[model samples]
Target chain A: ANEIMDLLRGMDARLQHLEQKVDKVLAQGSMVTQIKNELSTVKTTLATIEGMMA
Target chain B: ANEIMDLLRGMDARLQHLEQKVDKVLAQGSMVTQIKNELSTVKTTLATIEGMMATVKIMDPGNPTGVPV
Candidate 1:
């Protein structure tokens, strides 16, 4: 049981690290929206340029 | 206890490998956002240049397209 506890304890430690890592994953996930906004800005700008060129 | 420990060890090893694969996945996936951020900057500059060109074309009185009234 002691050895099981130790193995589980190491697992627990790695789990904590994974928790923080997943936090970063969520942060990175939010950038998808930001990327879309930038894409929209580019689209709008292109539209305006086309409007002028036409 | 030995049997249980072996069970736990198998579970632990499986999870250990799984975690590594997930970490690699996160590595590859997160990189694109960085690329997007830089791509956004390029688009921003393109917008600025287009803005200038549009103004120039609009201001040109004899332009064939005719300025927007």
Candidate 2:
């Protein structure tokens, strides 16, 4: 029957694509978040150096 | 963290979707197995009937080159 939406087939295809995409995104996202956190730490250390330079 | 939960929620949603697909695949697989069983029965019936009709029943070797060629 032609329905408004077929969740089964749609999810089957989209989920496969999404599964791969999400893993890739999460991997990069994790690396990005880690770098952001590290940058914050470095910024804090830079602030200390700036204070000492005065 | 709220940010972590958000990403996990996104993953959770995808996982739920995947589960549904997996269920459909499992149903299809079971149906396939049923069809295969039916086919095998029909094949066995054909083979046995052939053996009865033929004076000598030849046992086909597994991947025999000479027999096939």
Candidate 3:
């Protein structure tokens, strides 16, 4: 029973680490998407300016 | 057998949660694609207008100095 408990604890620790990593990846992806949207808005404004100038 | 059953049940619950997250990602992807389509439409319309303006310049000498005027 003790050995089973130790093994189970170790697996839990590893899974916990993986869960944290996935969470971080999800967060980074969200930030990247938000930044991309902001950049796209800038590009659209620049394009509109250029079109108006032309 | 009871502990095994409990483990299975817990796993099912966690999997259900994960499935929900995956569903959100899918729905979000669809909405993002829709906005992309709208943006593309606006982009195409602007290009057409710009082209028309250039043609207008060739047809009329009375245009406002191209655009910087």
Candidate 4:
């Protein structure tokens, strides 16, 4: 029973770590979306420049 | 004892979900970094072009010089 309890405690600790990782990844995902939006804007600007050059 | 087991089961399921999310983010993060690198290349190319153009004197300010001016 004590061993089972220890295992459960270890699992809890691992779960906590996993949750933190998820949180960090969620933040990163938002940043990635932002970057994607900015890149789209850059593409548009490049297209406009190309049009002017042509 | 039964309640503890149930709680543990719930925790396990939540952990699985978290693991899946992390995996997705890991894949997305790699792609994001790749796009960032490509963008950097684009910036470098644009800078090179600008440098080349800076040396050229503009003959006309109102119209495109390389095309019709």
Candidate 5:
């Protein structure tokens, strides 16, 4: 029983670590979305330049 | 041992879900990196356009070069 308890505790610790990993990834996901939006705006700007050239 | 075995089974199912979650996040991480690279490139292009804009504007008594004047 004691050994099993220890195993469960180890898993608990790992689960905490995984929680942090998920959090970091979530933050990165938002950052990437922001970058995607910015890149889209850049494309809009390119369209403006192209219109000017035409 | 039976009780412990049941607990282990529950843990196993939860771990499988966590594994799937981790896999999805890892995949998103790669996509994020790809977009990060593209965004970095956009910054470079913006810098180039900025440099060109500095030399693009023409001034000689308020008549822009691209104007019909």
Candidate 6:
């Protein structure tokens, strides 16, 4: 039983780490979405400049 | 003992799921890096264009002849 308890404790520790990683990934994903939107804006601006040049 | 075994199995399942998620995030991170590199390339091109425009302005301060040369 003690061995099982140790294993459970180890798993709990790993789970906490995994949870932290998930949170970080989610935050990064949100940032990526924002960057994608910004890229779209830049594309629009470039097109506008091209039109003006033409 | 059986209850403990069940708990361990449950934990194993969760650990596998977490590992899969980590793998997915790593893939996404690589893609993000690629996108960042592309963005840097675009910025470099824009800078080059700006430099060229500056040079053209210097070459022709004011085209009094009104020619599109």
| Candidate whose DockQ is highest | 5
When 1 and 6 are scored with DockQ, the better candidate is 1
Colliding residue pairs in candidate 6: none
lDDT of 1 at A48: 80
> Candidate 6 at B66: error in angstroms?
15
lDDT of the structure predicted as candidate 1: 0.79
Model 1 native-contact share: 0.39
User: Residue by residue across B26-66, what tens digits does model 4's lDDT show?
Assistant: 66677777877787787678756655555443645776656
lDDT preference between candidates 2 and 3, better one: 3
- Every model's Cα RMSD, please? 3.7, 30.0, 6.8, 5.6, 4.9, 5.3
Kindly list the per-residue Cα lDDT of model 5 for residues B1-69, writing each as its tens digit: 698689887986899698788968666687667768878887788858855764564534576565355
Give residue A16's error in model 5 in angstroms. Answer: 0.6
The worst-scoring run of ten residues by lDDT in candidate 3 chain B lies at B60-69
B10-57 per-residue lDDT for model 1 (tens digits): 887898898898798679765686789688688978878897896786
Candidate No. with top TM-score: 1
Candidate 3 has what TM-score? 0.45
Q: Write the per-residue lDDT of candidate 1 for residues A1-54, one digit (tens) a residue.
A: 476678778999989988987888787778777777888888887888788777
Please write out the lDDT profile of model 4 over residues A1-54, one tens digit for every residue. Answer: 786788678888887877787787788778778777867867776775575565
lDDT of 3 by residue, B1-69 (tens): 669758856775686577567656644555565665676676677667777765765676675454455
C-alpha positional error of residue B20 in candidate 3 after TM-score superposition, expressed in Å: 1.7
Model 5 chain B poorest 10 in a row by lDDT: B51-60
Per-residue alpha-carbon lDDT of model 3 for A1-54, expressed as tens digits? 465577567667756755775676576568558757855865776586576666
Summing lDDT over every window of 10 consecutive residues in candidate 2 chain A, give the lowest-scoring window. A1-10
lDDT: the better of candidates 1 and 4: 1
Candidate 5 residue runs with Cα over 4 Å from true position: B1-4, B13-17, B20-24, B27-31, B46-69
lDDT of 6 at B49: 74
Sort by DockQ, best first: 5, 4, 1, 6, 3, 2
lDDT of 6 at B13: 85
Worst 10 residues of 4 chain A by lDDT: A45-54
